[PDB]
Design a protein around this ligand. Structure first.
Ligand code: CHL
Ligand code: CLA
Ligand code: CLA
Ligand code: CLA
Ligand code: CLA
Ligand code: CLA
Ligand code: CLA
Ligand code: CLA
Ligand SMILES: CC1=C[C@H](O)CC(C)(C)[C@H]1/C=C/C(C)=C/C=C/C(C)=C/C=C/C=C(C)/C=C/C=C(C)/C=C/C1=C(C)C[C@H](O)CC1(C)C
Ligand SMILES: CC1=C(/C=C/C(C)=C/C=C/C(C)=C/C=C/C=C(C)/C=C/C=C(C)/C=C/C2=C(C)CCCC2(C)C)C(C)(C)CCC1
Ligand SMILES: CC1=C(C/C=C(\C)CCC[C@H](C)CCC[C@H](C)CCCC(C)C)C(=O)c2ccccc2C1=O
Lengths: 740, 203, 214, 73, 39, 81
């Protein structure tokens, strides 16, 4: 029986534990003896299952922390709407979105920094933004700063509500453990109620607000003369002027004359030629269909009325001759281990963010997004990075489950047990795949660089020499181009111009165009396959050997996070699953850097550019297919050539990017001191420094220590990632703002 | 035991175990049904009485301008011309006075009998409640001393009329959205031509 | 117990009813520490007495100006008018004089707070008993209370303390109203009262134009 | 740092423009842009899609050193 | 209030307050006296 | 009334409800095995109908009848019928 069960007033609201750092931990609550305690307090703060073994207390902490995160996100979102309302050129941009650059940040005049308030157009000075908010606000139908102010105020009210709820559901009415373990009810509610009703309500907003206002905007009406959204709500004749089926009202819906609504629920495909964005009527039909599908999906699981599926029964039924007991025991794992749930959800959420990056560049859903090249590059790169980090986190929390929550008694000859029982085969086969991929992907580039340096371009892997055509992807492109003819007859156009066909041009600039694939694309895709497989190898090997190995048979007793098991057995540094996360982060960085470099160069060379009478003048003039098949081509024609904007940015509004470019190079190099060294050296150096302080009677009572081995690794990888990613960030943004 | 208890709780919301804290407790939910019921009876009588009296000529205001959603509550749907005070100043007064009433009632709920202790211009004599939050009684709230022997029957009648009024107020809202006319205008069109004026013809 | 600010709610436990104006109001528990509570008591007294003097010096000149007998400028303009009318008295000299005089008296009050009765030693011009102080925030003596209204009887002193703290809180709220009304109307407070008296159903916060920017 | 200094100061002296070092070396973007970026242009064009010249051995060894450096990490 | 002021006396809160004061002082000096190179 | 679409919708809802009432569908009080064999289930839901037909069964079967009828109507309009 699914029911609400809470405990009343479980935790008093008091500042007493605020005054006692480390109160949550039995080891840390006694206070410091050394400086290691300062770091351990922050490192252990959100490790709830380390604080207690009671699953109910952990779950309550997780629920209220999630409310806190939602409140922070709403404060951030309300800030973005407020800065659009108060510190932006949004209304001017609305009158002229082709020539005016979006800006919603203004710097104060002090120490000369007002040079960063660039001349972005619309009689406005400020920092140019690349988040895409203007295009999103325009698609929503927002025409004034007053509506941006209203959303900002409403967001802060909802942010306060989230913070109230987190306090309330931890301190006043904390749900019991059986409430959280109602996974069938939660899936039913999150499918039908969150996603389904969310999509239905957003289809409602699109149909009643976004469609008529954007129709008038693309007709050329001044935004100040467009009627407000509630005028389209209250005056059905006003909406029927733009969509004549609205004169029939809701009668076509209730009599199943759905084809009457074809004027605002469409299946055009492709892009709106005025704006370069997806048709908003297509989006309304999409979100309506999505809403219906999710509302149906939320009725699968049994809660209180007999009908529906038991997830445990489904899992226990799916077993076969190769797989022993199959999915038995997985329901108990996924209803008792928060870490197993986090591993799955991080893997899929990160993969989703990466898919979002690809789908939004190829099918730009916002008006004037596709010709705002800075915004396009930024959102692709951002969502790619978020996805990669989330996937590495999935590997981490899978390993944490394996160390802390795995129980061999509950996994006898099931899928998890059998996977552990052939981990050597899995890891050795993946090792071979990674070596093969590295050879036959990177060695092709090395072959090409060597042939080109020796003056033998005819011996190269290229489109004008030994060819490696990606014929499968080319066939996929041709199939998707030909789809409106036969396999999707009621769709007027293909889903994206990238498959084939004509250039979509907005304001004399390319919004989208066919993206052809040749030998360089083959080579870089196999680079992607190689880097992804190596990152998988590191993370999966960390998960499979988290508990034991032939080297260290009792590794689970050493925990998830430990530096080593000593210099013996030849040396066992970085055997822990945590250290596999540490190495997988670097390989994720390598992989995703090549992915976003591939994106930036290929769009600049083959898609983006200006339209003339003769054709398209691309930003870097088609040089991807000529030189992306050598490493020297990447180094010269991408890195050296395109860094001209960031290193010449001094004295302009883009000078902040030049400074951040240098500072990020610095932070990256700074990280190597942590990664390459070891704490024994630093502790001895601190001994000499401490002697100097003791001589002058300025030695602290909290005894200074070098960072732990694990903290040295964590600091090193954090500064490595921050420096490298911020270097690419400044390079990208200065380049595409200055030449876009 | 409870008045108007039909055993209708398909979402088991009045289950007592586990629902100790918060607003999903049984006591709060019965109290809230009673409060909703009484407000709905005031609304269901009041959202159609000016229209009925204007149609019959008892009041001089035209029936179009005293329709409940055109009299100032939703100014996009209409504003009544010149009350003695503008609606926002009236709302300010309403906030102050209704907050006084509602916070005193709430303090009786959380702390029963506490509103009969502190000086309130002598009004605290009749504001001690009864220990039952939905049914305070006393010398004012039951000033005619009704329900000497049929108090449970009167509670059932109050809840039945309140549920009917709640449904009627929902009907007022739905019919206002669908037809953009008053509820009595809808009733008279249904009476004058029943086949040609209903939900199938308004859709 | 005593009357409380929110009837039916128990008063804040660190407030016991001994202080004047104790209605148990401390929802943030700012007076949890007793020494910080004494400091906040002196803060409230200084704020309330300053507010009462200032509200008198706004209201009575504005009432006299409204009658037409005099032409005293409104409170938000008086510094500008004074400076324009006093070119031989610079702003910085006036500020320096005010800062040194208030510094002397406020440092004496501060040192009495740190050490009660320590200004009674006769260092300032031989004054001994008049600077000893009666209680926290209530100096008394023959200089601060020359009519002796605190030395008559206990109940009279408690009555006057209640009168003082309640009128002081009212004057603080009134000064907040003065600020808000000047920002919303651009007029003085007696001008606002006269406009409301002439036509009250039309002269309300809802029609000033800034409280409801619709 | 020592050899960067020697080479950049002498590059300005040999090309007859001492003002490049004197003005750009006081900040690190000057070092990056006017020493490393500016003087790598002929080197990385030792081989390109258009052909190769005698600097192609140095372009290849340049990349070779970058690769060996990275492998050490 | 004693527990709250003890929290405000924890090292990062004191660091935040002190560095906000120091940074604000430097910023306002450079606002009132722009571009100081020499004494 | 009497129109084609009304006929498909009413007929589909009626047959799905009647199949549920007479034990030819999974219901609240009878559930299907993996091999699709109906066995009784103690749902605890009160029902005045002697066959154990609950309001939950009415809601789900009317929904499925509406879904089948609407898909059939749109498909027959698309096919030309
Ligand atoms: C396929 C035909 C068929 C269908 C769809 C239904 C459907 C229903 N019958 Mg049922 N009956 C049907 C045939 C018969 N019923 C009954 C005798 C009853 C009784 C006595 C009752 C029902 C009731 C009900 C309802 C029970 C669910 C509910 O609580 O809703 C609400 C439901 C609408 C109950 C009901 O709700 O009546 C209003 C009820 O009390 N039926 C007989 C005579 C044996 C039938 C003969 O075929
Ligand atoms: C993640 C959210 C976020 C971020 C990164 C920013 C960032 C910024 N804001 Mg915006 N803001 C946000 C959310 C955000 N804000 C929200 C939710 C609101 C509505 C309350 C605002 C309302 C707002 C205003 C009204 C202003 C800013 C200003 C600023 C800038 C200077 C802030 C400063 O120096 O503080 C100062 C730091 C202190 C410690 C002093 C705080 C003092 C206050 C009174 C408390 C900075 C770019 C300023 C601006 O851009 O200048 C042109 C400015 O005037 N913000
Ligand atoms: C239709 C019902 C419904 C809806 C809409 C949601 C929605 C949500 N749940 Mg789920 N939940 C439900 C029923 C629902 N829940 C039931 C029945 C259970 C128990 C089986 C749970 C158990 C549960 C847990 C254990 C957690 C969630 C979390 C979440 C959030 C996921 C993150 C996100 O996408 O934020 C999107 C955010 C927004 C769109 C902002 C608006 C959200 C509105 C204000 C909340 C609406 C849902 C709420 C249930 C309505 C009740 C109102 C309340 C006053 C009673 C999201 C707010 C996670 C979390 O984030 O919670 C803090 C989380 O850890 N839920
Ligand atoms: C450019 C720097 C660099 C290079 C070349 C490598 C090399 C390798 N890494 Mg290492 N890695 C690096 C940086 C590098 N790493 C850094 C900075 C870290 C720290 C985070 C790591 C951490 C790391 C981990 C954690 C793992 C690797 C793995 C691998 C291997 C991937 C499989 C493969 O591609 O084999 C093919 C080899 C190459 C592509 C190298 C180039 C080979 C050339 C083209 C062939 C030349 C042959 C030559 C001409 C013949 C000899 C002639 C001569 C003797 C005269 C490969 C040996 C993974 C692995 O071991 O899985 C199998 C693995 O799990 N690396
Ligand atoms: C992820 C979102 C989420 C989830 C899963 C829950 C879950 C729960 N809440 Mg919490 N809550 C949330 C967000 C959420 N809440 C937010 C954003 C707020 C502040 C607005 C609150 C403030 C709150 C209060 C004050 C109470 C709950 C209560 C409850 C419980 C019963 C709710 C119910 O019966 O729904 C049915 C919903 C309704 C009957 C009203 C819906 C109307 C709104 C406008 C929609 C349940 C444990 C109750 C509980 O703890 O006591 C048992 C309770 O009293 N919640
Ligand atoms: C908090 C107390 C306070 C403050 C800060 C002010 C401030 C001010 N008042 Mg106001 N006043 C107050 C209380 C106050 N008053 C009270 C209680 C009444 C009654 C008045 C009645 C009043 C009138 C009738 C006038 C002022 C004026 C002024 C201004 C000139 C003051 C001056 O010239 O000193 C005068 C200094 C001396 C007489 C010398 C000091 C005496 C020593 C012993 C030498 C100045 C803005 C004038 C104005 O508005 O603009 C010029 C004005 O006409 N006040
Ligand atoms: C704690 C550091 C600090 C210091 C020493 C000062 C100092 C000063 N501020 Mg400054 N201020 C600060 C932080 C600081 N401010 C912060 C964090 C903000 C919000 C961003 C401000 C916003 C601010 C404004 C808006 C004004 C001052 C003004 C002043 C001056 C008179 C008061 C004085 C020079 C005033 C002025 O410039 O001189 C009259 C003035 O109008 N400040
Ligand atoms: C009267 C019987 C009947 C007929 C003739 C059709 C005919 C059709 N239906 Mg349909 N349907 C029916 C009853 C029927 N349906 C029933 C009982 C259901 C279950 C509710 C559905 C559920 C259904 C859905 C959900 C959809 C169709 C769609 C279609 C079209 C599919 C075209 C295709 O080949 O895609 C082949 C696809 C791939 C090979 C991939 C076709 C016109 C689709 C349509 O509307 O597109 C125009 C569509 O989305 N049907
Ligand atoms: C019991 C059951 C059980 C299970 O378990 C669950 C479930 C199922 C959920 C449940 C069900 C239920 C129900 C249905 C609910 C709903 C309701 C109603 C509607 C409410 C109202 C409610 C309603 C009410 C408040 C009301 C009131 C009204 C008001 C006063 C009004 C007023 C008016 C006036 C006169 C006039 C003017 O001109 C204006 C106005 C101002 C506008
Ligand atoms: C015999 C009998 C009786 C009768 C019964 C009846 C008469 C019944 C009926 C019933 C019915 C007749 C029912 C139905 C229902 C229905 C429903 C429940 C539906 C729903 C629907 C839906 C949910 C929809 C949805 C949708 C939409 C909205 C859109 C999209 C698509 C879809 C379709 C999904 C009585 C009890 C009196 C008595 C005893 C005996
Ligand atoms: C540099 C380095 C150190 C030395 C670095 C240390 C000890 C970190 C120092 C951090 C800060 C700067 C220490 C002081 C923090 C106080 C809170 C400062 C208060 C002063 C105010 C001005 C804020 C290691 O300990 C180490 C350990 C393991 C592998 C690699 C390394 C490594 O590379």
């Amino acid at each position: 029986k699914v029911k609400i069960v809470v405990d009343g007033n479980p935790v008093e609201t008091s500042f007493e534990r605020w005054a006692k750092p480390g109160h949550f931990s039995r080891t840390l609550s006694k206070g410091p003896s050394t400086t290691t305690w300062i770091w351990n307090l922050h490192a252990d703060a959100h490790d709830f299952d380390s604080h207690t073994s009671d699953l109910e207390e952990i779950s309550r902490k997780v629920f209220s922390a999630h409310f806190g995160q939602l409140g922070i996100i709403l404060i951030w979102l309300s800030g973005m709407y407020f800065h659009g309302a108060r510190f932006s050129n949004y209304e001017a941009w609305l009158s002229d979105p082709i020539h005016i650059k979006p800006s919603a940040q203004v710097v104060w005049p002090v120490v000369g920094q007002e040079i960063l308030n660039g001349d972005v157009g619309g009689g406005f000075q400020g920092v140019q933004i690349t988040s895409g908010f203007f295009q999103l606000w325009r698609a929503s139908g927002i025409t004034s700063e007053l509506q941006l102010y209203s959303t900002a105020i409403g967001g802060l009210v909802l942010a306060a509500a989230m913070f109230f709820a987190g306090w309330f559901h931890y301190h006043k009415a904390a749900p019991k453990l059986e409430w959280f373990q109602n996974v069938e009810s939660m899936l039913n509610h999150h499918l039908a109620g969150l996603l389904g009703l969310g999509s239905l309500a957003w289809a409602g907003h699109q149909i009643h607000v976004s469609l008529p206002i954007n129709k008038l905007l693309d007709a050329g009406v001044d935004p100040k003369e467009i009627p407000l959204p509630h005028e389209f709500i209250l005056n059905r004749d006003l909406m029927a002027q733009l969509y004549p089926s609205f004169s029939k009202g809701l009668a076509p819906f209730f009599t199943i004359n759905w084809s009457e609504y074809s004027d605002f629920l469409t299946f055009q495909g492709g892009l709106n030629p005025v704006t370069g964005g997806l048709w908003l009527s297509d989006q309304a039909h999409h979100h309506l269909a999505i809403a219906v599908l999710f509302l149906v999906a939320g009725h699968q699981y049994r809660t209180n009325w007999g009908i529906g599926h038991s997830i445990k029964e489904i899992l226990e039924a799916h077993k076969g001759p190769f797989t022993g007991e199959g999915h038995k025991g997985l329901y108990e794992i996924l209803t008792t281990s928060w870490h197993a749930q986090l591993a799955i959800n991080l893997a899929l959420f990160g993969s989703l963010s990466i898919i979002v990056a690809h789908h939004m560049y190829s099918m730009p859903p916002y008006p004037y997004l596709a010709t705002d090249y800075g915004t396009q590059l930024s959102i692709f790169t951002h969502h790619t990075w978020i996805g990669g980090f989330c996937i590495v986190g999935a590997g981490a929390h899978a390993a944490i489950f394996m160390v802390r929550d795995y129980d061999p008694t509950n996994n006898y000859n099931n899928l998890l047990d059998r996977v552990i029982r052939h981990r050597d085969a899995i890891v050795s086969h993946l090792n071979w795949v990674c070596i093969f991929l590295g050879f036959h992907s990177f060695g092709l580039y090395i072959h090409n660089d060597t042939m080109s340096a020796l003056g033998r371009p005819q011996d190269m892997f290229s489109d004008t020499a030994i060819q490696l055509q990606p014929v499968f992807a080319q066939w996929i492109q041709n199939t998707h181009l030909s789809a409106p003819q036969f396999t999707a007859p009621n769709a007027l156009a293909p889903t994206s111009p990238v498959w084939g066909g004509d250039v979509v041009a907005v304001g004399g600039k390319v919004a989208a165009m066919p993206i052809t694939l040749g030998t360089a694309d083959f080579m870089v895709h196999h680079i992607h396959a190689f880097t992804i497989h190596v990152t998988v190898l590191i993370l999966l090997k960390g998960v499979l050997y988290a508990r034991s190995s032939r080297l260290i048979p009792d590794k689970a007793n050493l925990g998830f996070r430990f530096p080593c098991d000593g210099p013996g057995r030849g040396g066992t540094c970085q055997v822990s699953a945590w250290d596999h996360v540490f190495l997988g982060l670097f390989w994720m960085y390598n992989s995703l850097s090549i992915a976003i470099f591939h994106f930036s160069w290929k769009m600049q060379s083959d898609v983006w550019g200006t339209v003339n009478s003769t054709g398209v003048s691309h930003i870097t003039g088609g040089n991807f297919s000529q030189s992306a098949n050598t490493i020297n081509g990447w180094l010269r024609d991408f890195l050296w050539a395109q860094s001209s904007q960031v290193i010449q940015s001094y004295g302009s509004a883009l000078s902040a990017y030049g400074l951040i470019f240098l500072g990020a190079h610095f932070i990256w190099a700074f990280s190597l001191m942590f990664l390459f060294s070891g704490r024994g050296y630093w502790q001895e150096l601190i001994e000499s420094i401490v002697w100097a302080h003791n001589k002058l009677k300025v030695a602290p009572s909290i005894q200074p220590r070098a960072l732990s081995i694990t903290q040295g690794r964590a600091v090193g990888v954090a500064h490595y990632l921050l420096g490298g990613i911020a270097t690419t960030w400044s390079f990208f943004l200065a380049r595409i703002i200055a030449v876009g | 035991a409870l008045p108007a208890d039909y055993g209708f709780d398909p979402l088991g919301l009045l289950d007592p175990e586990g629902k100790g804290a918060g607003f999903v407790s049984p006591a709060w939910l019965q109290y809230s049904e009673v409060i909703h019921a009484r407000w709905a009876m005031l609304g269901a009588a009041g959202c159609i009485a000016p229209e009925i009296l204007a149609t019959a000529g008892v009041i001089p205001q035209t029936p179009d301008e005293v329709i409940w959603f055109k009299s100032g509550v939703i100014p996009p749907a209409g504003v009544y011309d010149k009350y003695w005070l503008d609606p926002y100043s009236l709302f300010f007064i309403e906030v102050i006075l209704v907050q006084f009433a509602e916070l005193r009632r709430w303090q009786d709920f959380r702390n029963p009998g506490s509103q009969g202790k502190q000086y309130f211009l002598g009004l605290e004599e009749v504001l001690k409640g009864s220990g039952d939050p939905s049914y305070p009684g006393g010398q004012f709230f039951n000033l005619f001393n009704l329900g000497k022997s049929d108090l449970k029957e009167l509670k059932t009648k109050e809840l039945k009329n309140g549920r009917l009024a709640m449904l009627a107020v929902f009907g007022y809202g739905a019919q206002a959205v669908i037809t953009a006319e008053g509820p009595f205008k809808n009733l008279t069109d249904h009476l004058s031509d029943p086949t040609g004026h209903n939900i199938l013809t308004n859709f | 117990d005593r009357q409380v600010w929110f009837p039916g709610n128990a008063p804040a436990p660190h407030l016991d009813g001994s202080l004047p104006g104790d209605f148990g109001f401390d929802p943030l528990s700012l007076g949890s520490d007793p020494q910080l509570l004494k400091w906040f008591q002196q803060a409230e007294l200084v704020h309330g007495r300053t507010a009462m003097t200032a509200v008198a010096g706004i209201l009575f000149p504005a009432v006299a100006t409204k009658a037409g007998v005099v032409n005293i400028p409104q409170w938000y303009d008086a510094g500008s008018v004074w400076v324009q009318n006093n070119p031989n008295f610079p702003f910085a000299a006036l500020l320096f004089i005010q800062i040194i005089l208030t510094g002397w008296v406020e440092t004496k009050r501060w040192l009495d707070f740190k050490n009660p009765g320590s200004q009674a030693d006769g260092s300032f011009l031989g004054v001994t008993d008049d600077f000893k102080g009666v209680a926290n925030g209530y100096p008394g003596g023959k200089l601060f209370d020359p009519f002796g209204l605190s030395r008559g009887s206990e109940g009279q002193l408690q009555k006057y303390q209640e009168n003082e703290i309640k009128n002081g809180r009212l004057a603080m709220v009134a000064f907040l109203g003065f600020i808000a009304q000047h920002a919303a109307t651009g007029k003085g407070p007696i001008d606002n009262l006269a406009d409301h008296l002439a036509n009250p159903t039309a002269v309300t916060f809802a029609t000033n134009g800034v409280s409801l920017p619709f | 740092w020592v050899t960067f200094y020697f080479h950049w100061k002498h590059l300005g002296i040999w090309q007859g423009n001492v003002n490049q070092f004197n003005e750009s070396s006081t900040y690190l973007m000057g070092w990056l842009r006017d020493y490393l970026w500016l003087n790598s242009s002929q080197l990385i064009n030792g081989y390109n899609p258009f052909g190769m010249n005698s600097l192609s051995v140095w372009a290849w060894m340049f990349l070779f050193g970058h690769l060996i450096y990275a492998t050490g990490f | 209030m004693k527990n709250f002021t003890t929290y405000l006396s924890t090292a990062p809160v004191v660091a935040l307050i002190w560095f906000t004061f120091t940074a604000g002082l430097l910023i306002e000096i450079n606002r009132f006296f722009p571009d100081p190179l020499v004494f | 009334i009497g129109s084609t679409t009304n006929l498909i919708i009413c007929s589909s809802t009626a047959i799905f409800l009647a199949a549920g009432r007479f034990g030819l569908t999974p219901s609240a009080n009878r559930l299907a095995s993996p091999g699709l064999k109906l066995s009784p289930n103690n749902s605890g839901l009160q029902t005045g109908d002697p066959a154990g037909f609950t309001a939950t069964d009415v809601l789900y079967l009317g929904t499925i009848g509406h879904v089948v009828g609407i898909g059939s109507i749109l498909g027959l309009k698309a096919i030309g019928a």
